[PDB]
Design a protein around this ligand. Structure first.
Ligand SMILES: Nc1nc2c(ncn2[C@@H]2O[C@H](COP(=O)(O)OP(=O)(O)OP(=O)(O)O)[C@@H](O)[C@H]2O)c(=O)[nH]1
Ligand SMILES: Nc1nc2c(ncn2[C@@H]2O[C@H](COP(=O)(O)OP(=O)(O)OP(=O)(O)O)[C@@H](O)[C@H]2O)c(=O)[nH]1
Ligand SMILES: [Mg+2]
Ligand SMILES: [Mg+2]
Lengths: 65, 183, 65, 183
């Protein structure tokens, strides 16, 4: 019933959207990385496997999982 | 890699028809008998090929229950296409189709209203009971500006993939799609 | 009063968190770009000014602004 | 560039004391007389220097109103430090400090409880009226495990920057901080 309801929701949307876009920008840059702006293959992949790895960690303590 | 763009679909229709179920079926290939009234408005995103183009569809699910149709906060502005969904076994949900399509135009207010992509899904055809006839619904869709109509079954996934394919092509054939990240 | 309240909220948090992390990963990669993995300066900046620019666009139509 | 890490601060205290106001003051250097009951639990992030280390503080604001203290969904687990905040002019808010600090430990349950960073902020000192004495509050903080105490004024920003500085240093001097993105 919470009158401020149109708040958390409206933000939930905004953030969901951002999270989609940032996801783009990344894979974008991540690609623009191995462009002629060249640099190792399989590694740039591990970098991912590195971040996504670290991500879990930090995010976890952020939300108290 | 390849060029990318995004479409925004607004699925509308009375509470019950199967909007949430149709969306989940398409996006996650999942279904559930366990209902769960959708409040406010939320969305998902799915990427599929559309003729050498890589389109990401932003699918918005809305609330059919009037006492939850809160926001309506012009999250319609984007909408490159609008999906009018109803419960084939529930005649009223078909009766009020004009309510929604109209309501959409008034809110969204897209340039060239007489050509804006609309897809009508007649859901739940997997039930013996059936009060609305395909021909009837058909006669109606054409009667508008010859918009496509699909009898669907969010439950047994009938024409779900197929519905959204057309949903993807008509919105796209309208040039309104937004580019993505391609320097 | 909405009983599902502990839902939108709990997600609002999760997404807010993601948006923070993705922001990291970007500036990370964005830096890892001009590392010895070298590539023009002022430009990599315009790339930003490019995305952030495109971002506004897409995001806008996403939320119907 | 330089190494980075993150801290998680949980600000607690009875509804009214100034938690939301203290946080905004620190993070955006802004204040507002217009109250606005905080429901559930939300957070912000700010980055500042802490001895050649670049720390990003994740500051959680919570609900002081029992009929909104919903979740509590162990979003406490991270917490490298907990800020116990009360209304200096409102004695009860000081009385119930044990309620909160205890409650915290029980939830968070951090290794080495007898050393977990705690910062006590005596807010609103910018009001003539005043029912709790600095010495009293002081006598209490020390009495715990000699935790720092700061008389603050979210309104005229007294010790706000200063409070969070110590909040940053004690949480950090506890080795619990999480690294960031530095390959
Ligand atoms: N048999 C059958 N049941 C369906 C079908 N589609 C949906 N349902 C059920 O009908 C209900 C409709 O569910 P939702 O998609 O969650 O909601 P909605 O009513 O369409 O929209 P809101 O009420 O506004 O959330 C659910 O209980 C589904 O299990 C279908 O094709 N066949
Ligand atoms: N004079 C004065 N007023 C303050 C000060 N800090 C906060 N206030 C006011 O007291 C109220 C406390 O506000 P918030 O920070 O929003 O809320 P809270 O009560 O601390 O926490 P919740 O009720 O759980 O949201 C507000 O109306 C503020 O304007 C302060 O240092 N001085
Ligand atoms: Mg729905
Ligand atoms: Mg608060």
């Amino acid at each position: 019933s919470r009158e401020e309801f149109e708040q958390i929701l409206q933000e939930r949307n905004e953030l969901k959207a951002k999270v989609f876009l940032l996801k783009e920008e990344l894979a974008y840059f991540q690609r623009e990385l191995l462009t002629d702006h060249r640099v190792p293959s399989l590694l740039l992949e591990a970098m991912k496997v590195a971040v996504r790895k670290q991500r879990k960690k930090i995010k976890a303590k952020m939300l108290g999982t | 890699s390849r060029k990318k763009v995004l479409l925004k679909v607004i699925i509308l229709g009375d509470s019950g028809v199967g909007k949430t179920s149709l969306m989940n079926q398409y996006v996650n290939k999942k279904f559930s008998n366990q209902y769960k009234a959708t409040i406010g408005a939320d969305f998902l995103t799915k990427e599929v090929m559309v003729d050498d183009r890589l389109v990401t569809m932003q699918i918005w699910d809305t609330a059919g229950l009037e006492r939850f149709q809160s926001l309506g906060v012009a999250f319609y502005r984007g909408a490159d296409c609008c999906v009018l969904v109803f419960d084939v076994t529930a005649p009223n949900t078909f009766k009020t189709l004009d309510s929604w399509r109209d309501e959409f135009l008034i809110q969204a207010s897209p340039r060239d209203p007489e050509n804006f992509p609309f897809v009508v899904l007649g859901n739940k055809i997997d039930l013996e009971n059936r009060q609305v006839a395909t021909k009837r619904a058909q006669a109606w869709c054409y009667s508008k500006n010859n918009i496509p109509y699909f009898e669907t079954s969010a439950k047994e996934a009938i024409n779900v993939e197929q519905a959204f394919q057309t949903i993807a092509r008509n919105a796209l054939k309208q040039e309104t799609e937004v580019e993505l990240y391609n320097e």
